Structure formats: structure tokens, C-alpha cells
Design an enzyme around this catalytic site. Structure first.
Site, mmCIF file in Angstrom:
data_model
loop_
_atom_site.group_PDB
_atom_site.id
_atom_site.type_symbol
_atom_site.label_atom_id
_atom_site.label_comp_id
_atom_site.label_asym_id
_atom_site.label_seq_id
_atom_site.Cartn_x
_atom_site.Cartn_y
_atom_site.Cartn_z
ATOM 1 N N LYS C 51 0.862 -1.227 -0.121
ATOM 2 C CA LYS C 51 0.031 -0.121 -0.013
ATOM 3 C C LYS C 51 0.843 1.113 -0.018
ATOM 4 O O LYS C 51 0.340 2.277 -0.620
ATOM 5 C CB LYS C 51 -1.004 -0.101 1.131
ATOM 6 N N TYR C 259 -13.165 -13.987 2.237
ATOM 7 C CA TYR C 259 -12.211 -12.978 2.422
ATOM 8 C C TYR C 259 -11.935 -12.937 3.981
ATOM 9 O O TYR C 259 -12.915 -12.737 4.608
ATOM 10 C CB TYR C 259 -12.517 -11.388 1.761
ATOM 11 N N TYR C 285 -4.077 -12.365 3.225
ATOM 12 C CA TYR C 285 -3.579 -12.168 2.053
ATOM 13 C C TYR C 285 -2.465 -12.988 1.525
ATOM 14 O O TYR C 285 -2.528 -13.798 0.565
ATOM 15 C CB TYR C 285 -2.993 -10.671 2.020
HETATM 16 C C1 LIG Z 1 -4.017 -4.960 0.016
HETATM 17 C C2 LIG Z 1 -3.343 -6.153 0.263
HETATM 18 C C3 LIG Z 1 -3.111 -7.142 -0.697
HETATM 19 C C4 LIG Z 1 -3.998 -7.121 -2.323
HETATM 20 O O1 LIG Z 1 -3.452 -5.991 -2.968
HETATM 21 P P1 LIG Z 1 -4.635 -5.299 -4.046
HETATM 22 O O2 LIG Z 1 -3.855 -4.058 -4.537
HETATM 23 O O3 LIG Z 1 -5.864 -4.499 -3.212
HETATM 24 O O4 LIG Z 1 -5.169 -6.381 -4.886
HETATM 25 C C5 LIG Z 1 -2.210 -8.289 -0.656
HETATM 26 N N1 LIG Z 1 -1.382 -8.374 0.525
HETATM 27 C C6 LIG Z 1 -1.664 -7.555 1.450
HETATM 28 C C7 LIG Z 1 -0.444 -7.655 2.749
HETATM 29 C C8 LIG Z 1 -2.237 -6.116 1.355
HETATM 30 O O5 LIG Z 1 -2.267 -5.422 2.352
#
Ligand SMILES: *Cc1c(COP(=O)(O)O)cnc(C)c1O
Ligand SMILES: *[C]C(*)(*)(=[N+][C](*)C1=C([O])C([C])=N[C]=C1[C]OP([O])([O])=O)C(*)(*)(*)(*)(=O*)[O-]*
Ligand SMILES: *Cc1c(COP(=O)(O)O)cnc(C)c1O
Ligand SMILES: *[C@H](*)c1c(COP(=O)(O)O)cnc(C)c1O
Lengths: 331, 328, 329, 338
Positions: C51, C259, C285
Site C-alpha cells: 500500500k 475473504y 493475504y
Molecule cells: C491490500 C493487500 C493485498 C491485495 O492487494 P490489492 O492491490 O488490493 O489487490 C495483498 N497483500 C497485502 C499484505 C495487502 O495489504
């Protein structure tokens, strides 16, 4: 019949009070008069509850046989093991509990609050499965030269496990005497089975067996129902039921057990809040909250004959609320 | 004296039972007979407890006054506030609670399990931090609030409940055919032991009510019990004065602070739970259990004395000290 | 194409390192060579992560517009909101966060540890729940100028530049290394991380080599957002190709069951990766994308001799809200 | 001084960056320039941190001896044991961790979040004993070491914090050296360093490394043990042994070892109200998090020293961020509202 033939070791205060649930009933349209018999308030032994009533008839055999350790089992937030731990401590006996992961719930303190926390404080050896446990348990006791009294899940699948609640019906009759009237129904939560078993038998006597509306919280209705039906027949034998238990005497509503054993649905939560907020009477998200949910819905669906007087059996289970703190963070 | 003059609103199942603590008594030597009057098993309103006995005397006034919201206060794991919330819902009244941070304990679920958890399920407005602040809030909101101080203690009717307890004890000692020589009771806000003092002053046993401090500020606690006992003695028409000799308050077991157990507390809780199946908590009862056990062990009780331990309730707070008990 | 047209506010330590995962490769047969790009160690602002790379290209605009408050949104254990809270702090800006319960999970400390704990310490105003719109309005109304940052920074005009840059970085590092990677494994949920990558690698014809691993458990939709964001992004940097659906690869075999909820395979992958390389992944994630890659190498889905670059996006702090699951390992 | 004589196994990305704390420097009056050397961001191995810098000089020995297991020890939220666990997994070594609650604290999730949670996920055998078990008394340390042998493995003993070990202070000698190299890249010099101290080889390495250029007394240690005497003595002892080990041709004087004591309260692992404000202040100005046990105490120190004008006007103070952040997870109640 004669239940009096079997000794009963005093583990409760005596008969459990029946209270009217006027507000809740009014709140639901006052067509059905709701009451509650407080098994959840029956003992000074770590809050007691339904299982402790069952235990009064099992302990004599246990003592009779010279056993020095009470061994039982249940999920992490099992009310049964907690009561066994308290009863054991009160009777000067050791206690071994096998707690397994019976619920698909993962909460940070699930294994450290509520029922299980008490069992440990009460001195029970609380054995948490990996993630045969039962036989290891019994053996380790023998191995340590002790003599274990095996108490199956919920005290249900045992020759004596149906007794406690036969006398429950016997109590309701005495109270009905002073009450000048008989309850039209009895709502009870059902999982391992011997609670509703005794009631079916106890009320069979005066032909109300089918008035005992069991509400499944196992989410495995079939097995649960069959175990009630089975346990009843056997118990009926054990007491002298001048009648037979038909597959029509065993009632078990299956609409309120979802999604799984130990997990509440939104109706379960709303029911807990509704009842707690109108009567100041708490029920849990695993058991009683489901049977409460059942009644409120039955009533609300007019399934109960206007003028009916329903006796809600509150079996206990409240301490388990601590294992679901996030769900009730804002009430 | 005349307690009957005052109305009482049924919030309990009735008189609390007295039980023998045979195993514990025997474990400590057999020289002292210990018993327990279960105030912790007195009601169907979310476990009730001693505060509930107190409330039965205040509710009538709330009802009389046409009040519609009960307002109280206490620490995060307060037993008082939970009982007010249950009584409230049962009466069909509103409830505003001021949960203050009265304990230097840091636990991840302290404000989400046990007592406070019940207060929220019971539908109470649980405010975390003020007394006057919330009260006005209620008026300004168009509802008539009945003010219930901490522990129901410093209030005109707050001492009546336990005056009634000594009466109950008498009525039961009659049935039992023998009298208890002392009573061990935990004390923090005061009107519990205050009521007993007035109650037992009635038959010359005020000084046999052995209070054990759990506040860790014995001075104020003792003075509050005294003040309450005098005001209460006056209302019940006690034909006598409450002397300082009438207020026994042991200071040795409150440590290290209010809401914080010491090793003696835990030892006490484990011992009593393991010999009688009777649970006590780290904040209040465990401290009184601890004192009673220690008294017996010191021989402070005359060989043959019958000691009535009054279990005031409070077990639910155990959920907020889960790490301490993780292995027993 | 031209990425330099857009200003980048520095919030990272610089390019992210690439590490071989020699132990894991061997453990899985040594037929495929796995490497990792530590996007998770990219910043000193509360652990950073993917991010933060995204945010570098959004901040110049918030400043240009003279905004004084960063406003964003995400689930309880959202990494996005924690990184946004850390950037605002660093920048000297206010922060309002809309935290929604996006996961059917009810752990006792879910809203008090991990990411959300950090956001509150960092001074963000954390509002537990129109949700998004109210927040924004409220700032204005309070006298402030709020910069709107949609979930994951993804559905935003600039949301995709950060990772176009990622591919840029990768070719440069590939040069330095004297070789190139054949595939990139990456976790996708809101979309702009994979989209940015798709564009930056389209530029060299490896778009279809960016293997997305859905963690939304709503693959159709996620896949659509990657596709869209990617096309809107390829346009903004003047890609010479229009982005085709065949440019977007999103495996949906490892997203279950929902999710924010792991499956027994997710847990296994986290454990194996942690125990062979000392590199942690989370149950929401990365552990899912890690599960993905391990599964691929295992089923023999990568040609023998391939070099796979796992993009470790961050997320490790969320582990704290799943403490029961890992109590014994 | 010849640190280069000792081999160093890479467990880090390389030199840890240095960043200006302009926002915090400004908020405190602008009279002192604060920077932070980010040891907390030194590695891909479970967040790394200072202990990881120390480990780089120990592992070469563990490998040469043919050890197949790393055995260490620490309190429940120990940062050291978590780094050992990750380093082990990375090296293909087993790991046994001896742990006990070394803090008079008892949060509901203390032993299942943050550092210890990671160690378990990393595959370490985390042997956490019940209260009152007293490991340092029963010498559980040794039993673990022996049990590895008993099991037929060969353990490499790593003491609490890596400190009281022959090679434990080398890593932070490397820190002085690296700092010199950065002060030359930057074109300027740092006038002081602020470092949290408990088991002592972090500051000891610094003392030795900076004595080599007359800057030992510039390393302002901040006690987080709440047992300053012992801590000072351990730093001094470790410093002297390391000084000799690296051929420093100078004695470490009592004056070279500076340990402030004002910010350790009230107990090891327990923060004070100043600890908490420092944490919030630093986080809200720089976006840089610190913890209630270690760094939050040293951050509190620096801020306070700056505020009390204890720093000559114009000084460039280099705050060494040693790590520890994951431990915030065990103090969730305190930060429930920020
Ligand atoms: C937000 C996030 C993702 C997914 O990324 P996107 O750009 O929203 O598809 C994957 N891993 C982590 C650790 C995240 O914070
Ligand atoms: C089985 C069981 N608990 C029994 C039980 C309760 O503790 C409560 C509060 N309500 C309902 C039940 C169901 O009773 P039966 O006899 O059918 O099992 C346990 O703890 O294992
Ligand atoms: C309130 C309370 C006490 C102390 O009673 P006071 O009347 O305030 O002195 C003791 N035990 C329990 C369980 C309590 O709730
Ligand atoms: C271990 C540690 C310290 C103290 O370092 P010592 O070498 O033991 O004096 C400071 N901060 C953090 C984050 C640590 O883990």
C-alpha cells in the site's frame, strides 16, 4: 413409577423456582403465558445447571463403587465438565476432563475464560486434545492407582443419566399443584439427550410427553432425536413407566440449531438480547439462546394455542458467554 | 429496631441458604467450623449477589418516585453495575452506568467479558471513562433517573438490606438450633457490613461481624461503614449507639490494591474452590476467603467457633483475570 | 510508456530487495527457482508494505490540492488503513479511517491488536461502523480538506502507478542480476497492485506472466477490477497497447473459504514458508498467495527451470487477530 | 581495532538507513536535531532488529561447530527468541526456546500474540513454563541444551539477548563502524547516540566501536531494566571483554559507559505514563512506532533530555531504533483508545 428407588445425592438447593416471564410474554402479544424453571440457579457449585441435576443420581453409584476420580468430557466451553469439576471437588474426588475442539470457533480466550477457566481453578486436570483421549484418561487414573467413574458427554448416554430429569417432571407436578394449573408445554434445549429424555418419561406418566418441545442445538437433529428417543425408552424401563415411549412422544424442533453446534445465528443473538432485556434473564449463544430463540419464534408464529402456558426450562450455560466477547462488544 | 417499616421489592428467590464448609474446615485443622451463607446464589437476575439484597430496599423508592431509569457507577468489572442493569431490565426500566477505570490492571478483554459484558447484553447504556454528568444527561433526555451510588452504599436505604440479613441469620439459627459466633464479610463501599453491624448490634454481636477490607484504603472504608451504620441504626430505630468497637475491619488482606489480588488471594481462591467446589474472585470474595482461612490458620478463632462466611457474589469478574488462572 | 510524468513522494527506503528462497525451492523439489521481493520491508512507517508503494504516487496530489486530512477505509485488520495512518502522521496530516467488519470472524481482540492497534497509536481517528461519504463530509464540515483514498488505494486514478514502477524496478534489478524472472506471484483483492504490475510488464511482454492469486473469494469481481484499473492505468502512462483480458491472470483456487478467513492449506503454506525461510505471511493475504505458488510448483505447473518472483506485499501484523489458530504453531 | 577478523553471516539487507526526525525535532523546539538509525528495519527475517545484528557474528561459529539447533531464552514477549527462531528456520536449523514470564504483567493474550506467536509459527519448540516455575532457578536453560544432545542434535547456546557471550558485542562494534561510514557519506557527524539497554551487549558493542574514535561517552544508554546497577555492570563488563576481543588498544573507563536511569520505571516490561506519551508523540509526528518495554522507554529518554535542554543546542542525536514493535500486541488494553 418409582424414581425414589434410586438414591439421589444432594448437589442442589432443592426444587428449582418457576418464574413468570410477563414482560417477554406481553412483548410478544400476551397470547401465550411464558414461564421459566431455573435449573441454571439450582446450585452453589460453580453455578450448577441441568447437568448437576443429572449428577445427583450418578454420584451414588460412583461412591458406591468406591471410585476416587470423576472423569468426563466435552467441548472447550462445555458446561458439563465444569459441573463435574465442581461436584468432584465438593465430593472430595479427583477429576479428569477431556476437552476437545467441538466447535468451529476461534477466539483468543476461548480456552481461558468461562467454564474451562473455572474447571482449572476447581483443580480438575483439564486435558486439551492435539490440535484415544477418553481411554488414556481413564487409564492414567488407573495407572495412578485411582478408580475412575466414567461420565459420558452431558451425563446422557449412561444408565442413570435420564433420572435427574424424570424428577424434573415430578417437580413441575408438585409446583403445578400449588399453582392450581398444569403447564401446556415445556421448551427444552437438546444436545446429548438425557435432559429431554427424563422429561419425556416424567411427563409421559401424565400423558404430556409430547408437550415437551425439544429444540435441537446439535445441528445433527437425526442423531440427537434418536438419542433422546433411545435414552427415554431405556429410562422409562428403569423407572416403571406404565406406558411405552412412542416416536411421537419425542418432539424436537430443528429450526433453531444453525449454523452448527456452538455457533449462534442472528436469531440466537436477538433472542438472547430480547429475553435478557425484558426479563434480566441471560441465555448463552450455544444452548439456551437457541431454545429461547425457539420459543420466541414459536410464540411469534402463533404456533402456541392462545392461552397456552409454556414452561421454559433454563438449563444454565451462561458462563460460556465469555467465550464470545466480540459478538457482544456493544451488547 | 423495626426494619419491617420499610418496603422491600422481591428481587431474590428468598432467604439465602447456609452450607457447611466441612472439607475446608477439616483441611485447616478441624478446630473451627466454617459455613457459607450464599448471597451469591440469591437471584435469577444475572447471578445477583449482595448488591441485589441491597437493591430490594431501594427499588420501592424508585418506583414510588415514578423514576424510569436507574443510574449507577463502578469500576469496569463492577458487580454493582451488572446487578443494577439486570434489576433495571426486570423492572422494565432504563439503565445508565458509569464504568470508571478503578483498577490498575491491564487485560485485553477486561471491558468485554464478565460483568460489563452482561450489563450490555442486559441493554444498559454502558459509559466508560461523571456521576452528575450522566444524571443530568437523563433528565435533559426527558426521563426521571433514580440515583444509585457505588455499591448502593452511601444512600438512605442502602444499609437496610443487610440489617435484614442479620434477621435472616437469626431466623435460621433458630431452625438450626445453634448460633454462629462470627461472620466474615468482605468490605469495600460499606453498606453491606454496615447493615450487618446494625443487624447484629440488635442482639449484641456487632463485634462478631469481622469485615475484611478489599479497598486497600481501610481508613475511608472503615469510616464509611461507621457512618452508614449510624445513619442506618437511626432509621431502623436501633435503641443504641454504634461505637468504634462495633466496626471490626481487618486490613491485612486487601493488598496490593483494589482490584488486584496478591498470592494469598489466589492461594485462597484455589483452596476453597478445590475443597468445596465454591468459587470466589480476585477482587472481593477471594480476599475475604483469604482472611477467614488465614484467621483459622492463626488460631485467631476460638477452638469450636462457628464462622459464617458471607459469600457476596462476584465470581463473574474471574473472566477479567484469565491469564493468572491459565494453568489453575 | 512514461511513468516519470508523475511525481512520487518518497515514503519507502528505496527499491525493495529480492531474496532467493533456496530452502523452499529445494523443499519442493528444486525444479523451480523461487525468489521473493520484499515489498513488506519497504518502509519505516509502521512496517509499510504494498500500500505504501501505491501511496507514494497519491500524496503529491493530496498536497497539491492542499488537503489536510487523509481519509480511507478497510476492514478491521486492514493493512491499507494502517499504512495510511502512518503516512498521514509522517506527513503531518490528520487521518480519519472508516473501519468496517469485512470478515466473518469474531475474535476477542480483533479490533485491538495488529493493524488497527497501530492506527490508533499513530493518531488516526478510527471509526468502527453513508459510511464512506459521511466521513468525507464530516471532515469538510469540521473545517478540513480531506483527501479520499478508496479501499486499497485501488479504484483511484493514481492507484496503479506505484506498481507500474514495480516492474520498472524489476527490470533494473534483473539487469544487475544478469538474468530475468519468468513469473511473478502476487496476491490480489482490490486490484491496483496487480493492475500496476500488469501494465509495467506489458511494456516488455510479460503481462500474462504476473500470476494473480485471488484472496477476495469473489474472483469474477476482483478480476474485473484488475482489468479495469489496469486499462485506466495503461492509458495514463501512455502504454502503447490497450490492455486485454488475456493480460490478466487470476488463479482463484486458493481464496477460500472467504475473504479474511484461511483454509487448512493457507495455514500449511504459512507454516512451511515460515519454517523454511524465516519469512512470515498472513492468513488473509500473502499466505493465500504463498499457498498458491507452493501449490503451483507442487503440481508441476511452472516449467522445469523457471524463476518465480513472489511479491511479498506485507500484511504480517494481521496475524495478531488470529491468535487462537496459531496457539500451538 | 580489527572487527574484520571475525566472520559475519548475512541475516540483514545491509547497512541500516538513517532518517531525520524533523517533525519530532521541530515539535520539541527545533534546538536539537534527532535522527533514527533503523535497526528495527534491518531484516526480512520476522521483522529482525538489533538482536539480528548481534546474531550475524555468532552464526559463523554455530555453523563451524556443526550445530543443528539454536537454543535461546527470554521472557514471554522477548524479541531475541523471536529473531533466533527466524534465523534458525532460515538456516535450516532447529530451534528450542526457553521462556517464562519475566514481567509482573498478565494480559489475556500475552503468550499468544506478537513475538511468541511468530516464534511458534516459525517452527520453534517454545517451552513456556507456568508461573513460579522459575527457569533461571531450575536452570531450565541447561536442560534444554542437554535435551537437544540427548535427542542427538548439537545445540548452539545463545544467552538472553545474545549479550553475555564471547561474540555478543561484535555486532554493535560493527554499528559504530557503519555509522562512521555513513557520517562520511553524509558529509557530517552525529554528536550522540541514544540506545535502550537491558542485557547490555548492544550498548557494549557501541561503547567499544565508538571508543575507537573518542566517542564512547557519546553513547547515552537508557536503562529499561529498572535494575540500573546490574545493567551498567554488564555493559561495562561486556564492553571490556569485547574491547579486548577486537584488539581495541584502549581501556574502557567507568566514564565511557553512560546509563541514564530516569526512564526505566516502574519495572522491566511495564511502561510508565511517560513511556506511553513518548510512544504516542513519536508515532504521531514521525509515523514511527516504539514499544512499552524497550524503545518507548529510550524514546521517552531522548525526548525528555531534549526537553530539559540536556543536549547542547545544535546537536545531531542519532536514536538507535532497536526493534520491539511486535510486543505492542501484548499491551492492547492500554492502547484501546490510542
Ligand atoms: C491490500 C493487500 C493485498 C491485495 O492487494 P490489492 O492491490 O488490493 O489487490 C495483498 N497483500 C497485502 C499484505 C495487502 O495489504
Ligand atoms: C451437553 C452439554 N451441555 C448440556 C446442556 C447445557 O449445559 C445447557 C446450558 N443447555 C442445554 C444442554 C443440553 O442438554 P442435553 O442433556 O440434551 O445434552 C455439555 O456441556 O457437554
Ligand atoms: C460490592 C461487593 C463487596 C463489598 O461490599 P460493600 O457493601 O461495598 O462493602 C464484596 N463482594 C462483592 C462480590 C461485591 O460485589
Ligand atoms: C534486547 C532489546 C533491547 C536491549 O538490548 P540489549 O543488548 O539486551 O541491552 C532494546 N530494544 C529492543 C527492541 C530489544 O529487543
Amino acid at each position: 413409577m418409582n424414581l425414589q428407588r434410586f438414591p439421589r445425592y444432594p448437589l442442589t438447593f432443592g426444587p428449582t423456582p418457576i418464574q413468570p416471564l410477563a414482560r417477554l410474554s406481553k412483548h410478544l402479544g400476551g397470547k401465550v403465558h411464558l414461564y421459566a424453571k431455573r435449573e441454571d440457579c439450582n446450585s452453589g457449585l460453580a453455578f450448577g445447571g441441568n447437568k448437576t441435576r443429572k449428577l445427583e443420581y450418578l454420584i451414588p453409584e460412583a461412591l458406591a463403587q468406591g471410585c476416587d476420580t470423576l472423569v468426563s468430557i466435552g467441548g472447550i466451553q462445555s458446561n458439563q465438565t465444569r459441573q463435574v469439576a465442581a461436584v468432584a471437588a465438593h465430593l472430595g474426588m479427583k477429576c479428569v476432563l477431556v476437552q476437545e475442539n467441538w466447535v468451529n470457533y476461534s477466539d483468543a480466550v476461548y480456552d481461558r475464560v468461562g467454564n474451562i477457566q473455572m474447571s482449572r481453578i476447581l483443580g480438575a486436570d483439564v486435558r486439551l486434545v492435539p490440535d484415544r483421549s477418553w481411554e488414556d484418561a481413564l487409564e492414567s487414573v488407573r495407572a495412578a492407582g485411582g478408580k475412575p467413574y466414567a461420565i459420558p458427554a452431558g451425563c446422557s448416554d449412561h444408565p442413570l443419566g435420564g433420572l435427574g430429569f424424570v424428577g424434573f417432571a415430578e417437580e413441575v407436578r408438585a409446583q403445578e399443584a400449588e399453582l392450581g394449573f398444569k403447564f401446556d408445554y415445556v421448551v427444552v434445549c437438546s444436545v446429548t439427550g438425557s435432559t429431554q429424555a427424563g422429561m419425556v418419561v416424567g411427563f409421559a406418566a401424565d400423558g404430556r410427553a409430547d408437550r415437551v418441545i425439544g429444540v435441537d442445538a446439535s445441528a445433527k437433529p437425526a442423531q440427537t432425536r434418536e438419542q433422546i428417543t433411545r435414552i427415554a425408552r431405556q429410562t422409562a424401563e428403569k423407572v416403571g413407566l406404565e406406558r411405552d415411549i412412542m416416536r411421537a412422544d419425542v418432539v424436537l424442533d430443528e429450526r433453531f440449531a444453525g449454523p452448527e453446534y456452538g455457533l449462534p445465528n442472528e436469531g440466537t443473538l436477538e433472542a438472547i438480547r430480547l429475553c435478557a432485556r425484558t426479563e434480566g434473564m441471560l441465555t448463552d449463544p450455544v444452548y439456551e439462546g437457541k431454545s429461547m430463540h425457539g420459543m420466541i419464534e414459536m410464540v411469534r408464529n402463533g404456533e402456541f394455542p392462545e392461552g397456552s402456558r409454556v414452561l421454559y426450562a433454563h438449563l444454565g450455560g451462561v458462563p460460556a458467554l465469555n467465550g464470545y466477547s466480540f459478538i457482544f462488544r456493544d451488547g
